[PDB]
């Protein structure tokens, strides 16, 4: 029970520390001249568009599931 | 095939059958505890005596998750119809902004009392080019 | 500049005022001369009483100085624009700050020079990945 | 080549309304980086904490914007 | 000490000097706007970094930035 | 609007012919009586904005003659919903309660006063109190005061229901009157000498004189026979006993005498129903009414005395601005002189002391019938005891800091430094730091030396050091200051008090009153878990008070901030230069205040909990001993936070979370709701709008993609809204939290 | 199982969405357009324009590590 | 007059009355046909 729970511990701390080093590297090493109209530049021309459809799924699960459970009790 | 081999259905699940017989009532009626062990009976059943539901997409139960989608499906996009299009009759109308704190009440009821077709509507806003807009006329944030 | 002429305002002292990192690494003090015998509100606390004509006063730091400049001209029917505000060091080295060129800064005046005066947007700033490693930011370049 | 009551699109990227159609209310004289004086419909950011809303003008130049109407 | 900059979509309209609580803005007479003027900040000694300026500028996005830096007795805004 | 004469009689009455008309055109405006809000909402902070300013009348308008007629009208719309509030009550006890069929076995059956709609399963919510009706046990204690009133029919209740709603009606149009009709100038409101004269000889005074008349000829008749055995069918009505004069004179043998001894100096001779016997009631558990009589009497005497000490028209009397302008010492210069101008003008001065007066009353109210039960069979109904404690903890403790949010207020908007020069205010203004880095030192001592105890005999207990902890079986912490107190008290009725037969309370030392199986008070001793938890107390509200004080002492400025006058009462900040100014102004000092009252009366409520069910509340048995619910171990097991958190916390919530199935269920659905409101403001509370506002863009971006956008363009929460709904949602959580608890805790205790 | 396995879900897309909306405005939005120029972690921007608190790439990182300790709670 | 009927249409006043209608319904449907959940 507790190596299970410290490897997933352990990884919830990679994973936000792999995206705030992306962040990090937005800031700081992105060139936008250099990656150019590639496969990157495209995420960030169409951002709003990914975020609003994360928040759409963010709220059809949670709406629900917290529906769900209040329900039961 | 022999598909949910661990669920039972409720007329011959154990503890479902055990615990219908002392059901409680919802309503005024002392009848509606014997009303859901009668009209719960038809379900599938778990060793537990609860009902289960089977939402996979077969058509066995189309009664469990298919007909209240779709009927959620139907009332949502009548909601949202009319909300848009009462929406976009507004930003003609004197001061876009009172008129969506003060409600039109004879302009919302009408747009309301025609919503009944809003898949027709929205089909033919979409052949036309009125349901959706152009990425290059939308106000975007820099990159 | 030369000296510091003026009447310490009539205040029976309080807690808010100086300390002695105000007296051995720097404060601060204000001159302006009052048109009449009325009562003011410190900036340190309380309620004091100019007296008529020149006054003077000393304060920790600057910002206490400009809040009772802006206090005087606003709150009184005879105006105070004349209040000077000094910069006191421990050897007595004292200098002018506000109003600088004798004009408030307000209003434009001629013979000031443009500082931090660029020719572009925000919008135009360079990229961070041009000027990495360089001991320079995207605003100083 | 602009007048009193065309509808033009900003490109000024940073801009509030990069992307938005705002309404030319005047233009003034040569000699000044930025004369097209531009109404919008819907407010910015501008204002305090809590204000009730904010600017709907600016001005901009004629290489930042772009005719529709 | 922080960093007071300004830009050529400042339309001189001494706001942000009416703003500053520390005299660390000014204007001096330029040539972009019809008020002719433009915002200076020569005194950045004294900018403690409250964005008063900022929070006053009228302009699309602001024409005055304030950039925070190394921070000192005079920044921190120290009394004692 | 109407018409009427005059109304008055050589008088200061003061008042305007018609100043607003009666129009409708200004309900379909919304925001209009603010200047930036009338032109319409361009964001939707416009709307937010709209109810955080509704009854801001300061910003509104500058005349104070205007605001003050505002305010009156307010008072009287107040009292409209309060009256509607309570005849609610009594037409819920009139036809749907109990009342009549709990006041024939009191002792075996629970007070209900609700009917749930059996519906989608919720009709299991009606729990069979006892006699065959179904409902819910309520818990505020309604049929104690109405059989302490004298109510014995339905008929009775629903004339009060009636009534009640007579008098909101009369409050209702009294507002609209009052300032649109004849609105009262300001010739009519300055008079504090004459309105105190007033407020006290006719309100409070009157007030206590009729209801001690309506309780001889009411209360009392009919309580002495409740209390005999008599059936409420077979009690005589009220009226009959003024109808039959010789029935009230048989009853009492003072009453068989006259009236004319009372104005012939002959007062000892009423000792028949004008008692001083003290302590409860044997067959009730309750005060006496014979006492309380004769106290509300004596009340009204002296309330009716104490209005008569100001000066209005005729001469005679005091005025306010004369004693204030005489107190003045060597040590505060001209001591009160501008006081009476102070709280004569400043509407917010006036309610940051009438404010912190009326919790501080109410905590009293709480913490006198808790120990003194004044209402009959309250004491044995543990819930209703409980209930009440705590409610009127938390209206009080909420009241109090509503008094340092508008001192504050009044710093800000109207202290005028030219006005103060040298009196308590001015000089209190110069010395800021020194109060506050004093109680700044005396709450980190109470700190230290309150809860450091507890950390102490927690990890004491931990490494198996009995003989290292600081209990009764330890290094003793007894309170002999309280103890002493409360043998004081024991002894007052052979030595301070020879005319007095029993003690005030009997918390303090005496006998063990128990009605039917329970008990109704008994000796409160007072040991080191006791000593422990006082402080505890004290520390939390010394914290609260420090922040409460320096939200005022700070609102015109600071060291940081040298113009925060100018920034108004509620603003977030002033940027985040200087290090962070963040939560500077006295509105983040009254958020932040809110938070340590909430600790404070988290810890109090929990004492009493905690000290009733193991110290006092218990089941008597008929040899004399009495075992009490917790098995006493607060002595001995309230010294440790462990203690708190398994033996209290954890033993006792499982009522709570084993409710499901039964009437009790929703309260531990209420329960969890409360612990998922709490985690939900921990949302506002930790962020902030800068991320919100971005995200909006992308939803804004995604609602124009379908061209679906509100003209109404949508703004993220002010900071000072993020924070305001933060907290907000953390008391309604923890508040709900604790009393689905205490409900489901209290209920299922016998 | 199938109910608390959507509260996972939920609880990852949540969290993806607060750490890549503070990867992608790490450079800039309509609020600060000029984010690049302030680099990654930095306090805020003021409380004009209505309010910047917790508005850097920082910040979202601070708020998304709540959501990965409720996740793996 | 007109002033009192924009009142009763502004958006509180319509959002709870709309509320009140829907609750009506669903609350009356749940007491004549309960405990529904799914179709037969
Ligand atoms: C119990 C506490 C709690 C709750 C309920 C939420 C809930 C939510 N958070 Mg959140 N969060 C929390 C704590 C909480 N958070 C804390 C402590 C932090 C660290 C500061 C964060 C940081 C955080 C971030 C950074 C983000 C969120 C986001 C969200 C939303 C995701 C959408 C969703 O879940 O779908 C559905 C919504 C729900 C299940 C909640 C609604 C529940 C109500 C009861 C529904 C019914 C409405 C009700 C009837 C209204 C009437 C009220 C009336 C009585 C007056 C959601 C509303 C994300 C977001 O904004 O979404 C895009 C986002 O990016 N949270
Ligand atoms: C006409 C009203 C209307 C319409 C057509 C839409 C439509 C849409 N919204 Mg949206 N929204 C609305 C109102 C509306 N919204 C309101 C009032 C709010 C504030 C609570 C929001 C907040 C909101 C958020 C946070 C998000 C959306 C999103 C979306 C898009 C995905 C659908 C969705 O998320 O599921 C359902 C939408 C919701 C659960 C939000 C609440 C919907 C409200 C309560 C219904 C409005 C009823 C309206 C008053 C009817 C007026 C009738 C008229 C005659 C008076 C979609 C195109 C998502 C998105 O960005 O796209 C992917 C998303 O993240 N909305
Ligand atoms: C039908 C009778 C009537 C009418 C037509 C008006 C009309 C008006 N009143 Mg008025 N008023 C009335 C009765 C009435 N009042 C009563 C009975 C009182 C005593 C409480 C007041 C006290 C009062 C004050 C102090 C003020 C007004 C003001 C106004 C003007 C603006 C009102 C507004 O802002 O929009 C309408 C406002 C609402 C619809 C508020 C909604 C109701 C709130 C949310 C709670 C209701 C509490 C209620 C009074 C008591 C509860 C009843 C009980 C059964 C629970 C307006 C012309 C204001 C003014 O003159 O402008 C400067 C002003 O300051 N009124
Ligand atoms: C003996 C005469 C008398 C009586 C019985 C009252 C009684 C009352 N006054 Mg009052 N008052 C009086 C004389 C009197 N006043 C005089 C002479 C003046 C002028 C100096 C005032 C000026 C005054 C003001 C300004 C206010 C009151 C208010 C009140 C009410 C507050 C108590 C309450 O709400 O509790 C419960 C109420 C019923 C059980 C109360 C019913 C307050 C009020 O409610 O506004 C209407 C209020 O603000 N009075
Ligand atoms: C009789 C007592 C009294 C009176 C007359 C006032 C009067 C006033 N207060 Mg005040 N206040 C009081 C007590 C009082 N207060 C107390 C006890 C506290 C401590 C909590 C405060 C704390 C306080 C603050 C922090 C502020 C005021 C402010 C104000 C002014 C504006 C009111 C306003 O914002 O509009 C209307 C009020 C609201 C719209 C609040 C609505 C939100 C409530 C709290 C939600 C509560 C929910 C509900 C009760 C229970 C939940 C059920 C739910 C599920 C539906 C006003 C003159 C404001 C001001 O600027 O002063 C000039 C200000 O910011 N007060
Ligand atoms: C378990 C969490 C926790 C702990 C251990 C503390 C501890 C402390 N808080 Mg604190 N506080 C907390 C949560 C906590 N707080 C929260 C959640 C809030 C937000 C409402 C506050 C808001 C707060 C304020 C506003 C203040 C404190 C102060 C203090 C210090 C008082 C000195 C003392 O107690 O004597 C001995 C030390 C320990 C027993 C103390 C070290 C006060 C202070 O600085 O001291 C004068 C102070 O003014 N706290
Ligand atoms: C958001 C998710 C969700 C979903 C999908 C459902 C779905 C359902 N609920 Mg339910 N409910 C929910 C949330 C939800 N609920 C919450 C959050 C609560 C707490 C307030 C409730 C409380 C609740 C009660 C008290 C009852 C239901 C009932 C029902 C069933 C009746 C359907 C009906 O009325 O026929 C069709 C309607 C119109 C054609 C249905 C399957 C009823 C039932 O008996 O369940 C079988 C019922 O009594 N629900
Ligand atoms: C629980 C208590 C048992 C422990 C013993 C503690 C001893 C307390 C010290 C004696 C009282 C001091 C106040 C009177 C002394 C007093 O008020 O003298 C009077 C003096 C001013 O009087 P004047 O001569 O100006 O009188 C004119 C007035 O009418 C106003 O002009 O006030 C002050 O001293 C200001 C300094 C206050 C700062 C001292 C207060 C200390 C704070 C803590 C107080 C604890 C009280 C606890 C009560 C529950
Ligand atoms: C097979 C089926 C399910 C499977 C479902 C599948 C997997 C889901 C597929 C979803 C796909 C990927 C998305 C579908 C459509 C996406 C497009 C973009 C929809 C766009 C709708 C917009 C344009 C509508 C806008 C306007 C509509 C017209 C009406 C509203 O009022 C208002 C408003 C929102 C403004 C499962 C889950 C397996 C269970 C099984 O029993 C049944
Ligand atoms: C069915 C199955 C299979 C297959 C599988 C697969 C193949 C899948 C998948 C999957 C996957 C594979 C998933 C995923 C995940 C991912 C992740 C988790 C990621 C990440 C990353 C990130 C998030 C980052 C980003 C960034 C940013 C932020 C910006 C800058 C740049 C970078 C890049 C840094 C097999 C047959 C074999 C076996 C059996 C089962
Ligand atoms: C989520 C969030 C927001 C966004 C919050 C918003 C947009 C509030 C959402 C309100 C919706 C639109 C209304 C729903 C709530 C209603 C008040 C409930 C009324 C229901 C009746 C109609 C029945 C902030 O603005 C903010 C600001 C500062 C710190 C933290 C935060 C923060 O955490
Ligand atoms: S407010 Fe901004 S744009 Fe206007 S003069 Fe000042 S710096 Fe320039
Ligand atoms: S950031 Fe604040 S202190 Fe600095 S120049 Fe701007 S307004 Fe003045
Ligand atoms: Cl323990």
Known sequence: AALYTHHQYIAGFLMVGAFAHGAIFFVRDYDPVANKDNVLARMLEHKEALISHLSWVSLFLGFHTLGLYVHND | ?143 | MTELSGQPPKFGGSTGGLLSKANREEKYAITWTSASEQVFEMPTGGAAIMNEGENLLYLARKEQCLALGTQLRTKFKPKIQDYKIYRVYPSGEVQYLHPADGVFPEKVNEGREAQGTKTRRIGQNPEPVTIKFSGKAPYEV | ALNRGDKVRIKRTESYWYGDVGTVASVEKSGILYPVIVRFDRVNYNGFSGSASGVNTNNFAENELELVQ | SHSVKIYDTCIGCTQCVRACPLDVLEMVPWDGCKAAQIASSPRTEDCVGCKRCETACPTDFLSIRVYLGAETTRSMGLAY | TISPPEREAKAKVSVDNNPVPTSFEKWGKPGHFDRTLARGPKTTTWIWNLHANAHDFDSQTSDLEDVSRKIFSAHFGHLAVVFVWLSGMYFHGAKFSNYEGWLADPTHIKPSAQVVWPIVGQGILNGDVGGGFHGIQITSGLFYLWRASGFTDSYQLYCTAIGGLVMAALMLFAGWFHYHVKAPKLEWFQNVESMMNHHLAGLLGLGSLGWAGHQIHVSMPINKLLDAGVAPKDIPLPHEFILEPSKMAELYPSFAQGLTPFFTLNWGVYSDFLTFKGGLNPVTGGLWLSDTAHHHLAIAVLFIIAGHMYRTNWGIGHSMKEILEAHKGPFTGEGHKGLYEILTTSWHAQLAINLALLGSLTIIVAQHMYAMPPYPYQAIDYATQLSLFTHHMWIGGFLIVGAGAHGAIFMVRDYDPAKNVNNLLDRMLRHRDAIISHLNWVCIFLGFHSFGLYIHNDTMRALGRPQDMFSDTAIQLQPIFAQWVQHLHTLAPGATAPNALATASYAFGGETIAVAGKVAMMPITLGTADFMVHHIHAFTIHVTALILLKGVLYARSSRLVPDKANLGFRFPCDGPGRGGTCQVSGWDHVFLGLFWMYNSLSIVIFHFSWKMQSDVWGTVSPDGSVTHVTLGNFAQSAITINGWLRDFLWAQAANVINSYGSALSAYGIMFLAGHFVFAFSLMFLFSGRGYWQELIESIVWAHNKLNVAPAIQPRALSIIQGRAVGVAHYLLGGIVTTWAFFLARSLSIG | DFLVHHAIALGLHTTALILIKGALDARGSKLMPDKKDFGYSFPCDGPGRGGTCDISAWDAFYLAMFWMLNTLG | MDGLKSFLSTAPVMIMALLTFTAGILIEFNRFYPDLLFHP
């Open chain 2, 1 to 143: 095939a022999d598909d949910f081999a661990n669920l039972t259905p409720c007329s011959e699940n154990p503890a479902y059958l055990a615990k219908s017989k002392n059901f409680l009532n919802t309503t005024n009626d002392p009848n509606s505890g014997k009303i859901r062990a009668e009209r719960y009976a038809s379900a599938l059943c778990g060793p537990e005596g609860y009902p289960h539901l089977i939402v996979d997409g077969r058509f066995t139960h189309a009664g469990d998750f298919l007909i209240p989608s779709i009927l959620f499906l139907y009332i949502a996009g009548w909601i949202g119809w009319v909300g848009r299009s009462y929406l976009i009759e507004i930003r003609e109308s004197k001061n876009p902004e009172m008129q969506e704190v003060v409600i039109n009440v004879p302009l919302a009821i009408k747009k309301m009392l025609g919503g009944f077709l809003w898949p027709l509507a929205a089909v033919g806003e979409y052949t036309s080019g009125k349901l959706v807009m152009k990425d290059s006329e939308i106000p975007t944030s820099p990159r």
